[PDB]
Design a protein around this ligand. Structure first.
Ligand SMILES: OC[C@H]1O[C@H](O[C@H]2[C@H](O)[C@@H](O)[C@@H](O[C@H]3[C@H](O)[C@@H](O)[C@@H](O)O[C@@H]3CO)O[C@@H]2CO)[C@H](O)[C@@H](O)[C@@H]1O
Ligand SMILES: OC[C@H]1O[C@H](O[C@H]2[C@H](O)[C@@H](O)[C@@H](O[C@H]3[C@H](O)[C@@H](O)[C@@H](O)O[C@@H]3CO)O[C@@H]2CO)[C@H](O)[C@@H](O)[C@@H]1O
Ligand SMILES: [Ca+2]
Ligand SMILES: [Ca+2]
Ligand SMILES: [Mg+2]
Ligand SMILES: [Mg+2]
Length: 917
């Protein structure tokens, strides 16, 4: 045969199943071959010939199975391998697709992406097995999937990290998994997998030790995995096996009551001097029953907050778990200098031999901090490199608790402490627990990074790659994963199963769910429902550009599935603007909650029509953002929810309100208070802004969607205008449970991301006083009033979309509406069906997001009464000053919220029937 002669570039050939290669470079070329070398690079010798073995490819047509699996490759020129190819032999080393002209002169040569053929060859067999260090009756079975590795050894380490054994593992030909079976004496042992494996990024047969991707226990800072039996009673708090979910999640009416408090382990306790010092920033702070923080959460729970959602508490990578390598702001500046060489070489080096703590230094820097001298963030940006603080969207191991939140990060101790926290939240605080999970990316990839785990063990399989270059994509921020590949889908479901069964997690929030296939999220839900039939899944289902590779798990595509998604519709209508706003747009783009139209600031050009459009989105969201809900829009037109525009997209997208998570604040982007501070008119005084915060939250808390909120909205939480505070430390993320202030105006935010906002910040920042104890207590009262109202009646939380459509309506709609007045009715009368609430025949929710008093005549002649919960709050109520006249007319003061009711008599009454449209 013809010798190819006369280098390798890119990686645009795709070996997608046993006998199919997709490659643009082989088109119309007469000689197309797949060369391979076990132990070196497919390269030309001194002669210039390609002497490595090869498999010849013949042009062919893309099969239907291939086009279904990889629609983004379906137009690639297809080539067929001989049916007798030993795929397992080729996959052990480098493969290169080579095209040549009829004489054998090289036309192009490229590397091969093999994830498709790996799935087609091994995935079914490998999916039938279980992975990790698995303690059994007979002892232990280790198993790791590594279908391309040339060798795998199990390295066993002593407690002091001395090698005590290195065991060659046994490869299973059908699955490509490696196993090793031993005695029960290996319980508690540390271990890694010694890999000998070709990595296409380096084109080397690499040799390295890697922790177990199915690790369930770790040494300090995740350097070694550890054999554990999570069922061990020594790893459980007393009574763990009997722990029950305090809030039901079985029916859609159950789910709709979900009211989420999105929290972070350090944000909760890092500043609370009434938490024991040894527990600040730890899981166990939730057991400090006498602390300000825990007492505050207990009162929130009593008032109707039902779920704590935890920011990453799986093993993140971006905090060093070796305490001697970390300095926090409560510690001496001298400690910071000894762990942080960037500080020691900085303009702040003069503080190294001082006797001040870092937070004492930051405090003194506040007075002269400004846009022209952003020195608080200058020092804090250095502190952030070596402190204990990160949101943790940086996955190191998916199925071990984070070590730095434990009092002892070495070994199994963190498992019991994590469970002690979960038990404290459920049994002692009475709230369910949601975990934020981040399967959409890894912290790192490639053969060299300390935190690259999956991509060292099966290179180029667990990460999503560019079709041409083979580079790991970074749409997520970081190292994009590939949940469309079967063995990572399995890893995800197996991981969720441990969190569900062994840690008793009640629901899961999928970070960047839009990068997952719809089919994969649904398959995971099917598998977890077998373990916990009431588990709830939701996530960020924005529109993504992965739609060319598979049907994405988005808001639109999840309609009717029961998987929830955050809604950005009510969020942006009430907050104003969008997450991408910068500069003067942050002030111009007022929301319903900050007086769009009705209380304009000096920069906005918002029209009355535009303000009323935001109210349409807000009403639609209060009714659960349903595609088929019927309302009267700003022009008097009859519209389904899907016909209300949201930046060119159909606004209403859901089938049931339990598919919609409404919110006006979250860990991402500016806090609600900082948004109100950007947007409020200069003449809106401090007490008005507090009511703006409460009016904004009322659209969520009194709405039919699931209610979600940021830890501290009830305390007017500020991040000093920081938009993206993931690494902004204790300083900018502070929540003060002693109620002295809301952390506003503690220095200009990080210049790298908010520098473009310094001008507008300086112009708005000092408009009114910073909240103090009086305002914090009044906001907490407002907040607990809203959650208590939501909790008090099943009419707020109907759950079923058809039931919402049969019962929920709006008044003050159309072209003659009073702008900013949101009036929702919920029917419990005879035309709705059964009475769901024996105390009332109907409810009216009136939110007057306006600086005028408003009078309503819609309920004239009815028996309407102000809710007793709000009457009991007196002049501290959001309904303070509301008047219900004899004739049924109702007057609301400025910036007020009233829940009114028709009292139910001896039999079900007429109620508030939905108007015909
Ligand atoms: O150094 C790694 C990575 O750090 C930074 O990315 C972080 C984001 O800045 C931060 O906002 C957070 O992003 C997550 C959101 O909080 C979450 O709600 C959702 O939208 O997913 C995001 C990604 O998980 O965390 C990331 C990762 O730590 C930085 O911006 C990146 O450039 C950098 O590569
Ligand atoms: O991924 C890294 C990224 O994380 C954070 O950005 C997130 C936004 O904060 C968050 O609002 C969301 O953005 C979506 C909009 O909300 C939605 O209305 C629509 O426009 O889609 C947007 C995403 O396409 O998600 C992003 C992505 O996580 C963080 O703030 C960034 O700094 C960081 O770069
Ligand atoms: Ca940090
Ligand atoms: Ca793409
Ligand atoms: Mg960690
Ligand atoms: Mg009733």
């Amino acid at each position: 045969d013809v010798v190819v002669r006369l280098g390798v570039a890119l990686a645009d050939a795709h070996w997608v199943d046993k006998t199919t290669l997709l490659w643009p470079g082989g088109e119309n070329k007469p000689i197309v071959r797949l060369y391979y070398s076990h132990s070196s690079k497919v390269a030309a010798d001194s002669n210039g010939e390609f002497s490595d073995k090869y498999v010849k490819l013949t042009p062919t047509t893309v099969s239907q199975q291939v086009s279904m699996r990889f629609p983004h490759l379906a137009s690639y020129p297809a080539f067929k391998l001989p049916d007798d190819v030993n795929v397992d032999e080729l996959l052990q080393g480098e493969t290169v697709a080579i095209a040549a002209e009829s004489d054998g002169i090289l036309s192009s040569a490229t590397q091969v992406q093999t994830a498709g053929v790996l799935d087609d060859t091994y995935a079914a067999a490998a999916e039938a097995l279980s992975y990790g260090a698995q303690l059994t009756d007979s002892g232990v079975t280790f198993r790791v999937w590594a279908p391309t590795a040339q060798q795998v050894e199990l390295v066993i380490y002593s407690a002091d990290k001395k090698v005590i054994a290195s065991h060659p593992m046994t490869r299973d030909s059908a699955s490509g998994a490696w196993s090793w079976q031993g005695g029960s004496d290996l319980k508690g042992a540390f271990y890694r997998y010694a890999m000998t494996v070709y990595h296409p990024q380096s084109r080397k047969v690499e040799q390295y030790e890697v922790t177990d991707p199915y690790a369930h226990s770790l040494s300090t800072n995740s350097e070694y995995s550890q054999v554990v039996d999570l069922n061990d009673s020594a790893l459980k708090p007393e009574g763990w096996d009997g722990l029950t979910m305090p809030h039901a999640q079985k029916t859609k009416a159950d789910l709709a009551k979900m009211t989420i408090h999105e929290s972070h382990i350090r944000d909760l306790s890092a500043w609370d001097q009434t938490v024991p010092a040894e527990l600040r920033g730890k899981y166990l702070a939730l057991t400090a029953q006498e602390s300000n923080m825990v007492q505050h959460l207990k009162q929130l729970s009593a008032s109707g907050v039902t779920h704590i959602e935890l920011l990453p508490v799986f093993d993140l990578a971006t905090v060093n778990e070796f305490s001697d390598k970390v300095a926090d702001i409560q510690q001496p500046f001298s400690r910071l200098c000894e762990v942080n060489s960037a500080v020691k070489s900085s303009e702040f080096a003069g503080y190294c031999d001082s006797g001040s703590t870092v937070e004492e230094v930051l405090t003194q820097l506040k007075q002269n901090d400004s846009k022209d001298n952003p020195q608080v963030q200058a020092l804090n940006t250095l502190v952030a490199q070596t402190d204990s603080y990160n949101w943790g969207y940086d996955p190191f191991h998916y199925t071990v608790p984070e070590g730095s939140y434990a009092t002892d990060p070495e070994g199994t101790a963190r498992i019991k402490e994590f469970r002690t926290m979960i038990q404290a939240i459920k049994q002692d605080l009475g709230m369910n627990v949601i975990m934020d999970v981040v399967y959409n990316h890894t912290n790192a990839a490639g053969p060299t990074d300390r935190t690259s785990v999956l991509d060292k063990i099966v290179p180029w399989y667990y990460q999503r790659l560019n079709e041409t270059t083979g580079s790991v994509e970074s749409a997520t921020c970081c190292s994009d994963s590939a949940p469309e590949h079967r063995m990572f889908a399995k890893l995800i479901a197996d991981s969720l199963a441990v969190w569900t069964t062994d840690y008793k997690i009640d629901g899961f929030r999928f970070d960047l769910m839009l990068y997952h296939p719809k089919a994969q999220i649904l398959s995971a839900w099917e598998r977890i429902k077998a373990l916990n039939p009431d588990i709830y899944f939701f996530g960020e289902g924005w529109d993504s550009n992965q739609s060319d590779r598979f049907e994405i798990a988005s808001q639109i595509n999840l309609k009717g599935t029961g998987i929830g998604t955050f809604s950005d519709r009510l969020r942006d209508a009430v907050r104003g603007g969008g997450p991408f706003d910068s500069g003067d747009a942050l002030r111009q783009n007022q929301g319903v909650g900050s007086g769009a139209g009705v209380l304009p600031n000096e920069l906005t050009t918002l029209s009355d029509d535009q303000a009323r459009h935001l109210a349409d989105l807000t009403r639609l969201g209060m009714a659960g953002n349903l595609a088929d809900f019927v309302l009267i829009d700003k022009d008097g037109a009859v519209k389904r929810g899907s016909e209300i525009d949201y930046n060119g997209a159909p606004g209403g997208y859901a089938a049931d309100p339990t598919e919609v998570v409404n919110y006006v604040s979250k860990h991402d982007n500016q806090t609600l208070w900082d948004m109100i501070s950007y947007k409020a008119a200069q003449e809106a005084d401090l007490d008005t802004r507090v009511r703006m915060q409460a009016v904004s939250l009322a659209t969520v808390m009194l709405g039919q969607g699931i209610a979600f909120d940021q830890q501290g909205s009830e305390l007017l939480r500020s991040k000093s205008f920081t938009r993206d505070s993931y690494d902004s430390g204790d300083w900018f993320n502070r929540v003060d449970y002693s109620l002295q202030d809301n952390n506003y105006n503690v220095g200009m935010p990080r210049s790298s991301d908010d520098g473009s906002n310094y001008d507008i910040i300086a112009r708005v920042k000092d408009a009114v006083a910073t909240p103090g104890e009086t305002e914090l207590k009044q906001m907490t009262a407002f907040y607990q009033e809203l959650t208590a109202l939501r909790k008090s009646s099943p009419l707020f939380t109907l759950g079923d979309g058809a039931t919402v459509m049969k019962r929920v309506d709006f008044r003050n709609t159309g072209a003659d509406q009073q702008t900013g007045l949101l009036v929702m009715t919920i029917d419990d009368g005879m035309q709705a069906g059964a009475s769901l609430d024996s105390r009332v025949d109907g409810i009216v929710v009136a939110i007057n997001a306006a600086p005028e008093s408003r009078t309503l005549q819609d309920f004239a002649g009815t028996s309407l009464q102000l809710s007793a919960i709000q009457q009991a709050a007196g002049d501290r109520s959001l309904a303070s000053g509301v008047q219900v006249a004899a004739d049924g007319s109702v007057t609301l003061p400025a910036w007020s919220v009233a829940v009114l009711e028709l009292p139910q008599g001896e039999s079900q009454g007429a109620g508030l029937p939905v108007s015909s449209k």
